[model samples]
Target: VDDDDKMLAAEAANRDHVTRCVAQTGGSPDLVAHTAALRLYLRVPHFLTEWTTDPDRRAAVSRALALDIVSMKLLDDLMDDDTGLDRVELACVCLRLHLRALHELESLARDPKAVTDILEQDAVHLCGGQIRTKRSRATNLREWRAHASTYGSTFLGRYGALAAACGGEGQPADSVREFAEAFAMTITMADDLTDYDRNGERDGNLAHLMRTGAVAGQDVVDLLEELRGRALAAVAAPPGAPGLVPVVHLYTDDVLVRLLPRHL
Candidate 1:
């Protein structure tokens, strides 16, 4: 649990660091702009900043991380709800941010093919998810693509390999993908529940659960507790790439726990 505390602190610093680095690059030099961008994406940077000595590589990674957040947020907000951005406009925004980061990776990180390959695959996954979400109607929780778009492109959450590639530490692996997939599964479900409570979205997974009577009293709180158990385990001792566990832990404790409640 103490590790959880340390992870949370590190994650916040990482996200903010990306916000600062990414914001200035876009000519949004003000503190307000940085805060806005950070808040907008719920910032997340890659794992293992400790491995890197190159400041340029660090900045590139930070920018890549920030753009990753922005891309996801734009897509998520449009498909779901809760943003000032319009659906039509958000699509272009989403594409632009993600594309920039993908290209940015090539420019800075070395042995970069590992992460670049991973990112491209995930980007394709996200594109498919985006289209599915557009015409989606989640009749049940089991239909993964309908409700699991966030998880489907889980590679973005675990950019440790990219960071490793940048830092010349170690190459990333499929294990990092597994870590992010688990992280995505929990939060996507949690976000659905929270959205159901707020806007009463019947087409989402939570409403399907509610309708099916799987959760009645206090609704999904126990489910979250149950998910937290598995998710915590994954973060604490994942199957692969120990380097990425920290960032996954950060999502579990901070973004998923804190943000979902407000939406709920």
Candidate 2:
């Protein structure tokens, strides 16, 4: 498998694992799982195949698949007026499960710091998301874009770091972060264009533009072309994995649909 293929299969495998987790507890999985699935698979381009592919390590793989889906989960539960979830209970379950998974990953990761960086960066993103969720604030198109960029790129960097560390490749973390910036913005605009109207309550970026003016769609498309160029450049860059260019196309919300992690 090339770079995109590296994380491609992870899409289905992640859902299966999440389904098992939800069913065993008589609970059901939701879109939240999709977001974590992408993070779990992104770094896998050339790392940690020892556990990701080997049948003998399947159990280990599930336990090692710890990445926080709690941000999306929290907001999704809030949106669900019917089930009317419990935050404390949800947090408890998510926390305990992740803690257990981390315990397993600690032994497998060549550099344990990469594992911790994953958790710590997630925590950082959680803080920003919580602030946005609480404030109910809105910003201009570019302003919100930058916020989303920080949030998305941080996660992408963590994914890349984990991939590199587990593979013992010792690649430059800067490359991962740069790739994420272009990758994040590119996918973001596509979603903003199509999902602009359907995205309510948690609407952002394009929605912000739509609310302010009726003529911003072109800007979205225009910027997408620019971002796409940058994303391809990042893919072809020396420091990152080979074959990432195709992966960039397949990694967006629209392309992968149900298989993807729920992006903000």
Candidate 3:
């Protein structure tokens, strides 16, 4: 099938995986895995498929990735104080998601350990990133980028590694992983830029660096371009499988054009 058709099938599988997992609670935990979240989570397995071609293993990876995405969102809500539920209830659901995520990983007997390790290691980084955002205190672009790296790119990086471990290996996997990281970081930067004026001088705001004259607007623009270039270079497809590289180029440019100021 073509890339378009492949993604459509992935969407179907990813939606079912998420819905089935949520149904396991036998209660209304659907708040965490809404349509928006599903759209976001699908990227993990979609990117994974770029490196590997086996349908069976890809499905297994999808189950684990769905768990990872849902649980991470649940935890993020708990951390950000936006769950709109009692702490205990939210914690219980988060715990369930976490355990289920691990169980999905364990299903992959061939590479269970590495896959689990990737999730745990990145979870720590994701938590750290969330913590940094709470404190939101960055004095400069360098510091701000570091904070963004922790939470912003860690999820995609985890999937990239897991993707590599499952079927994608060596340079292709490495490139895909790098593309995910750089692409995510670019998005974070774009988000910060969009939130700049509203955020004032919040430490977590990348826009603050520009507003406070810590860095020029042009500098931020340059960084965005450089990051986009890095992302593009990592996955610029040759005369082989198109993979996720095409979408990366399109999505990355769309973010820049849609989110960034024309003047900058």
Candidate 4:
């Protein structure tokens, strides 16, 4: 196999192992589901490949899928509780985002050329044909900020509580901040790509602000590039959780090198 193929195979193996380990941990069902879903999100392409070639990988994928079904049931339980609308909304959004990301990765596996086209189409739709216009850019920026303000605080609060409960190495504050920033960036990029075509319309923020004379498409690309760089650097930085660092690096590298460029 070529280097890329070999790396992908290794990733597939690692993801399978992680999922098995998580399943056997006897942790809270919700935690197990979350971790398994996250693993699937990070390795959807590998899963797709393995679905046809490797029985074990396919079995792992099926197990993770079943876990997600259970996770959604747990989520339904939370909805009626005092979780609050904002917390529930964030949870739903995170789940949907992960699902959509996985779907995109799977689709790319089927048709590699679809990645760039699909993201651009999505961006156009979201940008409202105004991606080039100032108004569109302003609107998108506002929407992103509003989302961050609303859900971001809640995510951090919960993340902090979890970290404290675990007696983890670092302060909850730092970890939550870092995670929130990463999450926000991820959602923004996903939104931008998904709405690309709508954003290309005269009414679209991306089209009006970016497609027009207001901001360059390259500028947006550059921002994503920089964020990807920072994310990689963060994963590589010292004093971080060793196991988590390697996991993050593997996943982020897969995203940036294998997935992000394809969409771009």
Candidate 5:
């Protein structure tokens, strides 16, 4: 239960940080949906890598990443889900949080320009992926994988790139981003499996694809296993941070394993 405890502590830390930021920006702390969404946000940099020598910088980066994530969530709610909240007001709040995120990155990053540019691209991808997910009807694995790449996995790419740059250690930014994206896509698939029944007719839903015979559940398991192997290699390979192996192990076991269905 130690890992669970650690995970809880991490979640609390991020939640508190984001709550304060929301309050300062005249936004509602209650608006950032915690619980499951919070757990996914915790899967960002601080949970993934311990290679950063500066604890303060690591924590700052974590908080900044949390802000961006919450911003993205707010946008998702506005764009896709019905929350019965003021749309224009929430959009303003989202912009404020995103600006604050950029400020944190600019203040903490060694190369602020590069990091901000990376964040810009990530924002585009996150929104674009959400749009695709909202409208996509993936009838097969290839199309679904393409859809998956842009959807839930965008922020992980942001987290890995930013964390690697700020950590000032381990593999190149692109390499770390690749590993994080792979890990995220794996997590997303597991999430889709867990939400199989609840997703209903959402065509992009992996479970729907499985039920309709577009892709097999067993094949998805195999794909996730392959992703796990990819993540392991990325962490242990040349220029990799072997320190992150435990993070991957923890998520794969504590998170992914539980989310994956028993029947599969």
Candidate 6:
């Protein structure tokens, strides 16, 4: 057989071996669950790379990633039969929801303003046609706000510090710092919204409590607003670096706005 066929056979063999081992150890369920989650997590960077040239493809990947993550989580929760089929059904439904958002992201990327509009539309859709629900709306808002902050923090903690210490793309030290911070804030916010509910329940998720409504929704909204204001201020500050703003804006307008509103 050809090299490609040989490689495929090897991969299949490896997968089967892993499966058999898990099964024999009475860990098949956990293994399957974790494998699905790992697949979803691995898709993040790939989807981000595809956002510009092939948004539709990116959306499809995102939706699939989300499905894998949520479905696996649901399976883990069902170790006992008492969990009922409805939980399984809800897990499937969330997969569909994720696909819808992915499609919306693809469409919004073509028209930046669609980001805000889509968010507003999604907010109404998810919140039962109300932008603000007295009971659950506050919970939703708080989740969004916290997500925005965590997104910022993660970006700063990683890219910001690194970029400051070492320049890239011929950028000045200050410029790299500004770009990293701005880009991170924008990208993280978008990612947080897209994977909000799924990631919230995952261990080490910064936006966990926010997504679950453990905190006030208003707090989440306020936090996002503050982050946005800070990002804008940074962009307009002394360096007057408008170049970096557009990169962040594209993602926010294309993907984030649509996803954010839906969670509301």
User: Model-by-model lDDT, in order?
Assistant: 0.52, 0.49, 0.66, 0.40, 0.69, 0.40
| C-alpha RMSD in Å of predicted model 3 compared with the true structure | 3.6
Model 2, 28-47: lDDT tens per residue? 35434433444433333223
Question: RMSD (Cα, Å) of candidate 1?
Answer: 5.8
lDDT string for model 5 (52-79, tens) is: 5566676777777777777777877787
Model 4 TM: 0.35
**Model 3: colliding residue pairs:** 136-204
In terms of TM-score, how similar is model 3 to the real structure? 0.80
- Write candidate 1's Cα lDDT for 70-175 as tens digits: 6666566666655544455556556766777777766676655766675665665666665665466555444533446444435444464565555553333333
Q: List the residue pairs that clash in candidate 5.
A: none
Better of 1 and 3 by TM-score: 3
Q: Could you tell me every candidate's TM-score relative to the true structure?
A: 0.60, 0.65, 0.80, 0.35, 0.84, 0.35
Worst 10 residues of 2 by lDDT: 255-264
Cα lDDT tens digits, model 3, 4-85, are 7877777678777766656566435545345235465665567655655677777677666766666676677677675465
The 10-residue segment of model 6 with minimum total lDDT is 44-53
> In candidate 2, how many Å is residue 107 off?
2.7
- Model 1: how far residue 11 lies from native, Å: 6.2
Q: What is the total number of backbone clashes in candidate 4?
A: 52
Error (Å) of candidate 6 at residue 66 is 24
Instruction: Please write out the lDDT profile of model 6 over residues 37-62, one tens digit for every residue.
Output: 44323332232222122434433333
User: Candidate 5: where are CA atoms >4 Å away?
Assistant: 1-8, 32-37, 120-129, 169-171, 198-201, 253-264
